[model samples]
Target: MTYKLILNGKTLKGETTTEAVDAATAEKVFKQYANDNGVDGEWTYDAATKTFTVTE
Candidate 1:
């Protein structure tokens, strides 16, 4: 399923959501996206409600 990705405090880069089968996987997906997009900093993920946050 797709989850929220708050960039620098932000959407729709990949349609405003990142798909992951589980929390662990979701974290990985987000991390990669951040890296590829040149966004580096703290990342928070809580699939309990499918929300991810990144601050640089």
Candidate 2:
């Protein structure tokens, strides 16, 4: 399981990390990014897979 930051249908900036971040932490981190940038984005959690998603 891994956390992903996706934007414009691409994983934001680059590839995803090998380390797996939990859903709660991932959500907070994703939220902080949007907050820091003063923007909005989409957030999703793939319960089926071990992947989490955040998009701009």
Candidate 3:
């Protein structure tokens, strides 16, 4: 399955996987993508809420 990451109401990134990922792993992947893409914004992740917040 492929998961799309939306930032500021826009589709910023997408990921594909055949298995589920833990919170830590997901966070790592998201951070890596944003870094690699030079995304200059803020991302907040709640380990309990299981959500992400991105600016710009």
Candidate 4:
């Protein structure tokens, strides 16, 4: 399975385009995205859809 990290409504790009196969890895990638972009907020992940959304 592949998990995508979405910023706002669109998918991230470049180094921030990190994908994961599980929740733990997805969380790590989300943290990396937050640090790399200097932004943080409420993030939700759907295991069934394998999508991560940053809503803030």
Which candidate number has the best lDDT? 1
TM-score of each: 0.68, 0.47, 0.50, 0.61
Q: How should the candidates be ordered by lDDT, best one leading?
A: 1, 4, 2, 3
Ten residues in a row with the worst lDDT in model 3? 1-10
Per-residue CA lDDT of model 2 for 1-56, tens digit only, reads: 35665422333343243333567776577567645655346667666765555555
Runs off by more than 4 Å, candidate 3: 1-5, 8-20, 47-49
Which regions in candidate 4 have their CA more than 4 angstroms from the true location? 9-17
Q: In every candidate, how many clashes are there? A: 1, 0, 0, 0
For every candidate, C-alpha RMSD to the true structure in Å: 3.8, 4.1, 4.8, 4.2
For 1-56, candidate 4 gives per-residue lDDT tens digits of 45666666234333235656767877787867675776556667776766666744
Q: Give the range where candidate 4 is weakest over 10 consecutive residues by summed lDDT.
A: 9-18
lDDT of each: 0.68, 0.54, 0.50, 0.63
Model 3 compared with the native: what TM-score? 0.50
Order the candidate numbers by TM-score, best to worst: 1, 4, 3, 2
As for model 4, its CA RMSD to the true structure in angstroms is 4.2
Q: Which of the two, 2 or 4, has more lDDT? A: 4
The positional error of residue 9 in candidate 1, measured at the CA in angstroms, is 7.0
For candidate 4, the clash count comes to 0
